[PDB]
Design a protein around this ligand. Structure first.
Ligand SMILES: *C/C=C(C)/C=C/C=C(C)/C=C/C1=C(C)CCCC1(C)C
Ligand SMILES: CCCCCCCCO[C@@H]1O[C@H](CO)[C@@H](O)[C@H](O)[C@H]1O
Ligand SMILES: CCCCCCCCCCCCCCCC(=O)O
Length: 350
């Protein structure tokens, strides 16, 4: 009678008026997300393993990185295999409503968690690079720990709504994965959506911009400052300080790329969702929603690869532990030089 009926979840009428996408599409979708499961869990596992165990990567701020990897690891695990991948190969989410809720809720909770964690990372960047060298402040375990606690509370807060009726996680697109209902336009649903977008998304974004734009509108504040202290009878020991700023700067740059990655990955889907809740629902087709959600889902598998091609200490560790990964990205000692000088302290003028 129908090719979309789910005896465990009521499919919104909107996704029911369409025809059922070809088998090949379901199979590809399954294989696709499954491979995000592998790369995602694999790569984030590696960052969690190496960062918690390498001596070099032992500073408080790195906790954010670990927190981000835990976030992306779980996203990739829960959102790929087996909940979605298996659903695809059968062309039906066979894991019932509760699974669906857990799935959608986990997806939202860690998507909110990866940007907010990046926000905390953008803050650390601002304290070490965004403020004047004289006031430069490094991350402390105390601060860091409190910050991630905020991250977790925050993330759960803006994602748990649909768990209590203030919105809802249900099926979308080809009905083989779960998400938050962006179709239904009632007061309740719409407020939760507005909350998700503004508190969950725009929020950490402001923190990010305010921190990076603050690091940019300080490159010169630092440019001058570097000189004033430079000619300040500061011996060749000035090089040390310089290397440190380079080293930190590089990390700050990294931060921005992963943030860019996040935004480029989610914004599309975000947009398609808003059209469905505020614009021509007739646009949000099976593929209009599906394809942009896959692009979003894979977001949680990028940071680890970004780190492996631009994070020196991390790249060092990999060469020393799972060095096979660094094949096409060969390691070398020169990549760690700026970190060497930045810490090779000088004994009383030396
Ligand atoms: C298949 C994965 C799903 C359905 C993910 C659910 C994710 C959320 C509810 C994410 C919320 C958002 C962000 C983390 C940033 C971009 C904009 C939002 C509000 C859609
Ligand atoms: C890419 C995400 C950026 C996270 C920034 C990681 C912050 C680590 O920055 C680290 O600070 C240490 C000071 O205790 C320095 O010794 C390290 O060289 C520097 O890489
Ligand atoms: C469905 C639940 C998913 C959560 C599972 C997360 C597992 C990620 C790996 C954690 C590694 C932490 C290692 C700590 C080091 C010590 O030893």
């Amino acid at each position: 009678e129908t090719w979309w009926y789910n005896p465990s979840i009521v499919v919104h009428p909107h996704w029911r008026e369409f025809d059922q996408v070809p088998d090949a599409v379901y199979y590809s979708l399954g294989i696709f997300i499954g491979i995000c499961g592998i790369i995602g869990c694999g790569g984030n596992g590696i960052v969690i393993y190496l960062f918690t165990k390498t001596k070099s990567l032992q500073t408080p701020a790195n906790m954010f990185i670990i927190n981000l990897a835990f976030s992306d690891f779980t996203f990739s695990l829960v959102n790929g295999f087996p909940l979605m991948t298996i659903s695809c190969f059968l062309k039906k989410w066979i894991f019932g409503f509760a699974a669906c809720k857990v799935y959608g809720f986990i997806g939202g909770i860690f998507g909110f968690m990866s940007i907010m964690t990046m926000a905390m990372i953008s803050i650390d960047r601002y304290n070490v690079i965004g403020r004047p060298m004289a006031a430069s402040k490094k991350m402390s375990h105390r601060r860091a720990f409190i910050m991630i606690i905020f991250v977790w509370l925050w993330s759960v807060l803006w994602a748990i709504g649909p768990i209590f009726g203030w919105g809802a996680y249900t099926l979308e697109g080809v009905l083989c994965n779960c998400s938050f209902d962006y179709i239904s336009r009632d007061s309740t649903t719409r407020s939760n959506i507005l909350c998700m977008f503004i508190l969950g998304f725009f929020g950490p974004i402001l923190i990010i911009f305010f921190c990076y734009f603050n690091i940019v509108m300080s490159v010169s504040n630092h440019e001058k400052e570097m000189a004033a202290m430079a000619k300040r009878l500061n011996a060749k020991e000035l090089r040390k300080a310089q290397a440190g700023a380079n080293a930190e700067m590089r990390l700050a740059k990294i931060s921005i790329v992963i943030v860019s990655q996040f935004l480029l990955s989610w914004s599309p889907y975000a947009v398609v969702a808003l059209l469905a809740q505020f614009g021509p629902l007739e646009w949000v087709t099976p593929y209009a929603a599906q394809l942009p959600v896959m692009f979003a889902k894979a977001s949680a598998i990028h940071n680890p690869m970004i780190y492996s091609v631009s994070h020196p200490k991390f790249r060092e560790a990999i060469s020393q532990t799972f060095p096979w990964v660094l094949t096409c990205c060969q390691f070398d000692d020169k990549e760690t030089e700026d970190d060497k000088d930045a810490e090779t302290e000088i004994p009383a003028g030396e």
